[PDB]
Amino acid sequence: SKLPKPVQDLIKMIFGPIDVNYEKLKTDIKVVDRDSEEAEIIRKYVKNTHATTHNAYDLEVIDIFKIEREGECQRYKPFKQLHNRRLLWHGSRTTNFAGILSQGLRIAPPEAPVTGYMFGKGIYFADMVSKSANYCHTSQGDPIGLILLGEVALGNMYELKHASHISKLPKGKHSVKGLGKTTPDPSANISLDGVDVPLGTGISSGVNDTSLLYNEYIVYDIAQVNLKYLLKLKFNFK
Numbered sequence: 001s002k003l004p005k006p007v008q009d010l011i012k013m014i015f016g017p018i019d020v021n022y023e024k025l026k027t028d029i030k031v032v033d034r035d036s037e038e039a040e041i042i043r044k045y046v047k048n049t050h051a052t053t054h055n056a057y058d059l060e061v062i063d064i065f066k067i068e069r070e071g072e073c074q075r076y077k078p079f080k081q082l083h084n085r086r087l088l089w090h091g092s093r094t095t096n097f098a099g100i101l102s103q104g105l106r107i108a109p110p111e112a113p114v115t116g117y118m119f120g121k122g123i124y125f126a127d128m129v130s131k132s133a134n135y136c137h138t139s140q141g142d143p144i145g146l147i148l149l150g151e152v153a154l155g156n157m158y159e160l161k162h163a164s165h166i167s168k169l170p171k172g173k174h175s176v177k178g179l180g181k182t183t184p185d186p187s188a189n190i191s192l193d194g195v196d197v198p199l200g201t202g203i204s205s206g207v208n209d210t211s212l213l214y215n216e217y218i219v220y221d222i223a224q225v226n227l228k229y230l231l232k233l234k235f236n237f238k
């Protein structure tokens with residue numbers, strides 16, 4: 001394999017031939033350097049947004065991966081122009097990343113239960129690492145988890161305080177944002193490339209009348225997601 005050792009781990013991690021399996025992902029997986037601009041931001045994002053609720057463990061960033069799904073740059077071209085784009089977390093089970101890298105992040109299928117969603121069927125993201133990380137489903141005897149950072153064309157956010165069984169958006173709206181109580185400090189954000197990164201520490205949002213602890217982000221068109229990084233986390237339980 002003409003690949004770094006960290007990558008080959010990632011290959012075996014998902015599946016279960018290496019280079020045959022790498023093509024099946026249809027994704028260019030480069031390892032980001034630990035002493036770089038990206039890494040110093042990405043690992044700071046993970047440090048700051050580790051929330052007070054989710055103290056059952058502390059995180060440790062093992063390997064970062066710059067990812068580039070095939071054809072995803074061209075599919076995202078319309079939404080590239082749209083304003084308000086954030087780099088947001090999306091945790092998932094390690095089993096699923098085979099399908100995700102190959103087919104992208106997709107909407108939950110027509111059959112799946114519609115009762116068990118906050119803001120209808122869409123694609124969920126968080127500005128807190130600890131909220132998304134929960135959906136890696138790492139256990140004591142399986143404490144290594146994969147988490148996505150994605151460029152998400154939010155656009156005009158329909159900012160709600162309480163779950164709503166949405167189908168169609170208001171006109172002009174492109175995303176839905178669930179307003180949470182505790183938020184990454186807005187005035188401590190930075191811009192990596194043409195993207196907002198909400199890497200502030202957790203503070204009160206000033207939003208009184210909402211049920212959500214943390215913010216969440218939903219998009220209903222699968223072309224509004226551009227995957228950027230695919231971290232490898234270590235859950236250090238207490």
Ligand SMILES: NC(=O)c1cccc([C@@H]2O[C@H](COP(=O)(O)OP(=O)(O)OC[C@H]3O[C@@H](n4cnc5c(N)ncnc54)[C@H](O)[C@@H]3O)[C@@H](O)[C@H]2O)c1
Binds near residue numbers: 099108
């Ligand atoms: N999971 C999060 O990062 C997350 C972020 C913020 C907030 C939340 C909160 O969790 C609630 C549930 O969200 P859940 O992640 O289960 O998403 P849901 O829509 O129910 O389930 C679909 C799953 O299918 C995965 N997938 C997508 N494409 C593919 C593919 N090609 N191959 C294989 N798997 C694929 C996708 O990643 C997700 O795990 C939600 O209501 C919300 O309150 C989660």
Ligand SMILES: Nc1ncnc2c1ncn2[C@@H]1O[C@H](COP(=O)(O)OP(=O)(O)OC[C@H]2O[C@@H](O)[C@H](O)[C@@H]2O)[C@@H](O)[C@H]1O
Binds near residue numbers: 117211212214215216
């Ligand atoms: N009225 C609601 N309808 C549907 N889903 C809801 C509702 N209120 C909350 N949820 C969902 O429950 C979760 C709560 O979101 P946050 O307030 O940000 O809290 P979270 O970070 O997810 O941690 C609390 C979560 O873990 C457990 O304690 C508990 O099961 C709870 O869902 C999210 O998945 C959110 O979409």
